[PDB]
C-alpha cells in the first residue's frame, strides 16, 4: 500500500502505525553514560522537557564523577 | 461521503493558507499606508511652519 | 465509520482548520495596527526634527 501523511498529523500517524536523529543518538549516548555510572557507583513538548532533564542531570553527574575519580587518584598519590 | 469529503478537506488546506496569505499581504499594504499618510503629514507641517513664519 | 459518523467528523474538522486561519488572520492585522503607528510615528518624527 501507499500512504500520504501530511505534515500537520505526521507524528500522530507515525505513532499510530507503531502501535498497530543525531539528537537522539547523542541522548542515547548520554543515557548509556547514566547506565554506566549507576553500574560503576508522548507529545513533542513532553519529550522536549524530559530531554532537558536528561541533559541537565547528565552534566552534573559527569562533572561530579570527574571530580571524584580525579580526586581518588590524588588520594592514592598521597597513600603511595 | 468518504470520497467527497477528503476532496473538501483538501480544498480547506489551500483556503486556509490563502486566508492567512491575504492577511499577510493586507499587513504589507498597511506598511505602505504608513509611509503615504506620513509623507502627507510632513508637507502639511511645512505650511504650518510657513503660516507662523509669514505671521512673524 | 458509517456515512453519518464521518460526516459529523467532517463538519467539525473543516470548521477548526478554517476558523483557526481566520483567527490567525486577525492576529496578523492586529499586529499591522501596531506597525502602522510605529513606522508612521518614526518616519514623521525624523523629518519633523529636521523641519523644526
Amino acid at each position: 500500500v501507499q500512504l500520504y501523511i501530511p505534515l500537520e498529523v505526521i507524528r500522530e500517524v507515525t505513532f499510530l502505525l507503531g502501535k498497530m536523529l543525531r539528537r537522539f543518538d547523542e541522548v542515547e549516548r548520554m543515557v548509556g553514560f547514566l547506565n554506566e555510572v549507576v553500574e560503576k557507583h508522548l507529545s513533542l513538548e513532553n519529550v522536549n522537557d524530559m530531554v532537558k532533564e536528561i541533559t541537565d542531570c547528565e552534566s552534573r553527574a559527569r562533572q561530579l564523577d570527574e571530580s571524584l575519580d580525579s580526586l581518588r587518584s590524588k588520594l592514592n598519590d598521597l597513600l603511595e | 461521503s468518504q470520497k467527497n469529503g477528503i476532496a473538501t478537506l483538501l480544498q480547506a488546506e489551500k483556503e486556509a493558507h490563502e486566508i492567512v496569505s491575504k492577511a499577510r499581504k493586507y499587513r504589507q499594504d498597511k506598511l505602505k499606508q504608513a509611509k503615504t499618510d506620513a509623507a502627507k503629514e510632513i508637507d502639511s507641517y511645512k505650511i504650518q511652519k510657513d503660516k507662523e513664519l509669514k505671521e512673524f | 465509520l458509517t456515512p453519518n459518523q464521518v460526516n459529523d467528523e467532517l463538519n467539525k474538522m473543516q470548521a477548526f482548520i478554517r476558523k483557526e486561519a481566520e483567527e490567525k488572520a486577525k492576529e496578523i492585522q492586529l499586529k499591522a495596527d501596531q506597525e502602522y503607528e510605529i513606522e508612521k510615528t518614526n518616519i514623521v518624527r525624523n523629518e519633523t526634527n529636521n523641519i523644526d
Binding site: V1, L3 | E13 | -
Partner: peptide
Amino acid sequence: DSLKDYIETLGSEYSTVFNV
C-alpha cells in the same frame, strides 16, 4: 478503519490518502 477514525477524531482537517 483505524487510520480513518484517528485523523478525524483529532481535528486537523487535512485527510490522508491510502492507496493500494
